Amino acid sequence: KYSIGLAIGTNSVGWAVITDEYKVPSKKFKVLGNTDRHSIKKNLIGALLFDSGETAEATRLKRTARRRYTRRKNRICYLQEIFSNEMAKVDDSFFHRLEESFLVEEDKKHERHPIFGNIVDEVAYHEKYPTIYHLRKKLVDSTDKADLRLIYLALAHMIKFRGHFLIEGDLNPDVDKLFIQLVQTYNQLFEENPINASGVDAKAILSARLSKSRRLENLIAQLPGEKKNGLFGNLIALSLGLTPNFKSNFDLAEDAKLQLSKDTYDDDLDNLLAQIGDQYADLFLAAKNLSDAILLSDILRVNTEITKAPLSASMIKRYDEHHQDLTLLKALVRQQLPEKYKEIFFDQSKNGYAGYIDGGASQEEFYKFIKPILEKMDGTEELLVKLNREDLLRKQRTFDNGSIPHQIHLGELHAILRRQEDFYPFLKDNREKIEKILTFRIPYYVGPLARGNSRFAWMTRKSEETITPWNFEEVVDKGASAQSFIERMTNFDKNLPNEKVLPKHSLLYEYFTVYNELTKVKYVTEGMRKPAFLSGEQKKAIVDLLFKTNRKVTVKQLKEDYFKKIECFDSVEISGVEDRFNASLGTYHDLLKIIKDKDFLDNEENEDILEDIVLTLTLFEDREMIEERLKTYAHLFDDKVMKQLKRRRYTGWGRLSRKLINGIRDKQSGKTILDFLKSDGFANRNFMQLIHDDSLTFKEDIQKAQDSLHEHIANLAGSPAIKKGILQTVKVVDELVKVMGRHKPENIVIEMARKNSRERMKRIEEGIKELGSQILKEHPVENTQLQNEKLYLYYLQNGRDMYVDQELDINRLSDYDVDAIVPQSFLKDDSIDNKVLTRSDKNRGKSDNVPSEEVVKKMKNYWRQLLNAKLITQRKFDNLTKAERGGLSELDKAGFIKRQLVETRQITKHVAQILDSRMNTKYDENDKLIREVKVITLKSKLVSDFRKDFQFYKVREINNYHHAHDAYLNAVVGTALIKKYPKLESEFVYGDGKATAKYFFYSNIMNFFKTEIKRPLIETNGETGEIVWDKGRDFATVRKVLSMPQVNIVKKTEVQTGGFSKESILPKRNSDKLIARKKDWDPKKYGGFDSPTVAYSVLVVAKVEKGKSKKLKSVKELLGITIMERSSFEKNPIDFLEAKGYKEVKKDLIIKLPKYSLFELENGRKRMLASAGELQKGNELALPSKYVNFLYLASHDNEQKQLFVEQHKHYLDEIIEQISEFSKRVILADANLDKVLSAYNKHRDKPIREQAENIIHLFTLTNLGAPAAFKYFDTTIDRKRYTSTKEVLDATLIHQSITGLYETRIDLSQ
RNA sequence: AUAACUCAAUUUGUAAAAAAGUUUUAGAGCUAGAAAUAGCAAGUUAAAAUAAGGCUAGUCCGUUAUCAACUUGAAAAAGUG
DNA sequence: CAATACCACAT
DNA sequence: TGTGGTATTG
DNA sequence: TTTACAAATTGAGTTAT
Ligand SMILES: [Mg+2]
Ligand SMILES: [Mg+2]
Ligand SMILES: [Mg+2]
Ligand SMILES: [Mg+2]
Ligand SMILES: [Mg+2]
Ligand SMILES: [Mg+2]
Ligand SMILES: [Mg+2]
Ligand SMILES: [Mg+2]
């Protein structure tokens, strides 16, 4: 009798129930509660609205951050535990004064001076050591016995802020020396062409406070005849961290683009060295050393002979220069600009020095502020120099201190320890412990050090001790933990669920893939009558001769190196492979280079060992653990080979198990899968064939070897946002089925709807850096500007036209065109992968196909460079260069057209599968599923085109009815479509030359709805004779459906979860709004948190005390239970409320009111709950469809539409009138309404288009939900909010179901 | 539709770390003046917290997902037009 | 108890 | 971007 | 901000059921 339509969105689920003739039923639903109404008429159509589901990312970031905090705290505690006794001998309450430092003097139990406990000593301390780095340097250099408190402070400062762990190994803090060395190996390599490095201040030039490229040019400038693109230039460029290409230097065909910071460099340099010889290794190694020294120079900037604490010394340098420059600046301003002195050095709000030190002004804002001040005055040259160097008035605690490796802090710490262990025995006994505190870091593969109470943890214990940084290796089983870290996420074999999947880089796996590909290769010559398979001996010969000698095997190599060389074929045609074999024996060649023993790799005896080695290299990344793991094979290789093997690492896992590939044997033949791949007589059967061959036992053994709704949906691959919509739509379906007397629908039609700036800046920066372009220096940009499409494309294309090979102009983007690579008529693609910036789209070639072969031939190399720079992707490149591959065939066109209507997205198939499995649960006599309900999936294009073709227009901003309407139209169009063409069930319904005809078929699939294109008035199916669409009275029914005033729009009520409040840590203030950041931290003294989020409001009817005499006064109000107060409130509501000051609370009348709780008042006026003290608009404006269609037409053959607009231009006043009466009845914002009316009467002179487009904006005043601001024309109208929830307390509360069909109304008069 | 492989891109989930920021306190402000106020000096650093907190007491957990109302029922979850 | 202006997040 | 919290003004 | 890892998914290809 009925079908269901569904529109699944990220914030909405549209639903509709239709009958045989495409009508939606209306029904009487019972109404519960204590009101007058016992029932209500409802149309079976509506939409569920809900806030977006969130990812788990934020939660994760905060969790991990938390752990970082507690662990840092623990580091400090370990340090204090070590210092405890001796400190107790020295200062009885040092640590106590330290711990209560935050407390006000009134709350302190000890002296207010932390370090020493008295004024004179404290002042003396700060006098001698103005910064902590002074004390650090002092404790590093001096040999005098020092106060244990200062020692502690230094060690603790180094431990609390230890620096990163991005660099492995030890660091011993030079550039001149390694430069002279570089010149040395270079000149010793190139005897004929030497370089004069006399008088070349390499230290000052390379360690300069400038960009790497500029420094490169500066260095090259001192070298006559040497250019930056030359070899030495590329070496220095390597040391500076650029991306040089050593191809041009060594006459290579393979580009030697190598970046030092890139993780693949260590193998790239081997790939390069294998081509130019091993003589050049010294050179590049030198270059790397010089690079390390350069980075260290970036951090330190202080000579190493002066002190063993270059970092602290550098900070002290910052301090001294800050002092000198401050004195200078103050004097200068005193002399020349006396009026600006107060503004600069006294006002914290003006971003001057005062704002820079005491205010919230950053270093950048401060440099921005004094820039024209320094420019205007005289004697401020060097200050400007430092300002552009970002080296002026620098603090010691700065954003760019993230460069600091932990090794140097460790160096200072070790120095201080070695210095003071001469006087304190406990420092000698605890030296390595203290060092380990700073050093130790829980491995990422171990995870949280839990004991059975963490859902995130996985680590295994080797013992039951309390884990400390010192006993970590003994208590924690690092091996089992690291193994679990990977194995808990990796797939088992689908075919053999109890079998682990092989490493992707396994030798056996690679043999499998190579043989599997090779088996389906066929060849024909002049003498043969038919292409033949490769036999076993041929495959083995090809493997041994080609696959085991070449990294990659091309077709040319197959023909010439095998078919000519072994078979004596001058000509042969190959069918199995394209250009080159996709599969390869990469690991074989890696291990061949490492161990240098081919016979060892070819020996079948060593198979297990090699598999184990590759497994070790894959499963782990820690070189130490890898080394320990490979110890059993140390007797097989030399130590050098062992270290080379150590360096070798792999990532990633296969898809199949070893037992599948080469374990299970066929019962009759005794052959494994791989055995069949190597040799299978006449029929070279595939893995797919082997797996499904009834004459073999593989299928048998595999078949023999072989989660709630919420969990199932959660386990799907996709954004949680759409997943929420999926669960919701399933629940909606369930309820609709309940509504229809538990009768299942005939059909269910489902349709599924289709920061970044930083990523864009990153892509452009790395791309330009790869390209070695100057366009970024010449044309600087901000990430916010990259939101613009043409500008982003401009930078992605290096400021060049993508079709013509010419530069473009930034100021001329408005004149340029954004062309689609593959035409939008075939591919509805809006992404960058299909868009391109060109001067004129005419220059792309023909407008019917991919850019012409002419363009492809002109721009292939440029596109190659853009590809290698990651500025364009592989897909974009292939789409750009398709013309040389025949362009778009008619089959491709037909495919595109059918894909415009047929849903291929996996997530939608999952939705359809869920629904189908929930509705169809019965089997027939042949044990086959009975499909009572057909689940149809359509794309949005069908309904959209349907709306455009029959003028059932959609305007989203008018109300939320369009979701419901979309669902309805989905049901109608879908049911009609399958009824008209039952053959198309295979395409649209879930469950189990000619291309031109297919193209035209799918291009005119929706023609049966039209009367002329010339078709009959009544459309029916040919075989059944069943009428599918009556063009005379069906559109009428649809029109009546969309014109229906009442539509069940239901805003999902949700308890608010997440952060307690705003994260902002506000200064002290006299307000009860402030929340204590800790239990005993009175926010009036210490400041604290503000703006908490209400989890859900609560209706309280009780009595409160009034006046000095506390007279009990009966009250009824809404109390917002915050997220923080929630657990306490739910543990015992009565105690909570009574603690809030309420008395005699009516427990039974306590009503939980989550956000978006619906209330109805007098004139059908509705309000939703935004909070405990704010309301939202709860009504929908059911604007008549005539006005909607008119708005659509006016805001955007065409002449008839224009004539309709001009003939019905009186509709404007009518629409304004509708909005007006609706606003007077429901919105109740007369001021804003008056502003609207006035603004409308102001721009009555404006063209109809503009007035329509601006009338569109007016609906935000009447829109359901939170009030928002909107501009009519140039008149901005601020939102009028509802800052009082008092009126709701006497209104009628409406409890709605997911569909809103079942209601319980409670008259809050009590 | 499904499977394996190649290349690339995207998305989801997890772990270990870093640099800041903020907030109170500690860095004897000096004079003149009865008084606010006036002139000048000065500033770069540190401690501590970084969701309140919890019991399971771990170098653990605390911001995702999920949620009409009623009837039951401790609870889970069923039932109700 | 209006209009109304500012704030967050920025790791 | 939004929208609920907050203080200011009145 | 950095590093390490796994899984789907899309979509251009080779081979199959
Ligand atoms: Mg804590
Ligand atoms: Mg030169
Ligand atoms: Mg600071
Ligand atoms: Mg190929
Ligand atoms: Mg590995
Ligand atoms: Mg939630
Ligand atoms: Mg800080
Ligand atoms: Mg509801």
Tab-separated table of N, CA, C and O in Angstrom, chain A residues 523-531 563 567-573:
chain	number	residue	atom	x	y	z
A	523	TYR	N	51.415	-14.582	-25.233
A	523	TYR	CA	52.241	-14.081	-26.328
A	523	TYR	C	51.930	-14.775	-27.652
A	523	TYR	O	51.541	-15.941	-27.673
A	524	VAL	N	52.099	-14.045	-28.754
A	524	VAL	CA	51.927	-14.603	-30.095
A	524	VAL	C	53.071	-14.191	-31.009
A	524	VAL	O	53.571	-13.071	-30.918
A	525	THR	N	53.477	-15.093	-31.897
A	525	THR	CA	54.481	-14.771	-32.906
A	525	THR	C	53.930	-15.004	-34.310
A	525	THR	O	52.716	-15.045	-34.508
A	526	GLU	N	54.825	-15.154	-35.281
A	526	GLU	CA	54.420	-15.356	-36.669
A	526	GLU	C	53.965	-16.790	-36.935
A	526	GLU	O	53.049	-17.023	-37.725
A	527	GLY	N	54.601	-17.746	-36.267
A	527	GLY	CA	54.315	-19.151	-36.498
A	527	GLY	C	53.117	-19.702	-35.745
A	527	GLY	O	52.499	-20.672	-36.182
A	528	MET	N	52.785	-19.090	-34.613
A	528	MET	CA	51.693	-19.583	-33.777
A	528	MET	C	50.333	-19.246	-34.375
A	528	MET	O	50.191	-18.267	-35.108
A	529	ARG	N	49.333	-20.062	-34.061
A	529	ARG	CA	47.985	-19.841	-34.567
A	529	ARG	C	47.133	-19.133	-33.524
A	529	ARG	O	46.061	-18.612	-33.831
A	530	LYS	N	47.619	-19.119	-32.289
A	530	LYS	CA	46.857	-18.592	-31.168
A	530	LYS	C	47.819	-18.229	-30.046
A	530	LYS	O	48.782	-18.955	-29.800
A	531	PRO	N	47.573	-17.092	-29.374
A	531	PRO	CA	48.392	-16.682	-28.228
A	531	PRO	C	48.450	-17.766	-27.156
A	531	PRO	O	47.425	-18.354	-26.817
A	563	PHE	N	62.420	-12.824	-25.028
A	563	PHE	CA	61.894	-13.464	-26.231
A	563	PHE	C	62.881	-13.486	-27.399
A	563	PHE	O	62.922	-14.449	-28.161
A	567	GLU	N	64.332	-17.148	-26.918
A	567	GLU	CA	63.383	-17.790	-27.829
A	567	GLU	C	63.648	-17.495	-29.308
A	567	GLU	O	62.987	-18.059	-30.181
A	568	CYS	N	64.606	-16.613	-29.582
A	568	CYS	CA	64.942	-16.210	-30.949
A	568	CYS	C	63.782	-15.529	-31.680
A	568	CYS	O	63.624	-15.692	-32.887
A	569	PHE	N	62.988	-14.745	-30.961
A	569	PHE	CA	61.886	-14.024	-31.592
A	569	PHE	C	62.291	-12.591	-31.889
A	569	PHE	O	62.686	-11.853	-30.991
A	570	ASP	N	62.212	-12.208	-33.158
A	570	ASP	CA	62.454	-10.826	-33.539
A	570	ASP	C	61.189	-10.010	-33.307
A	570	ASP	O	61.252	-8.819	-33.018
A	571	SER	N	60.036	-10.656	-33.435
A	571	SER	CA	58.761	-9.994	-33.201
A	571	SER	C	57.848	-10.872	-32.355
A	571	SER	O	57.754	-12.079	-32.567
A	572	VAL	N	57.182	-10.252	-31.389
A	572	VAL	CA	56.265	-10.955	-30.502
A	572	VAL	C	55.260	-9.973	-29.893
A	572	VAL	O	55.613	-8.841	-29.557
A	573	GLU	N	54.001	-10.389	-29.786
A	573	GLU	CA	52.957	-9.535	-29.222
A	573	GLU	C	52.546	-10.020	-27.830
A	573	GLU	O	52.252	-11.196	-27.636
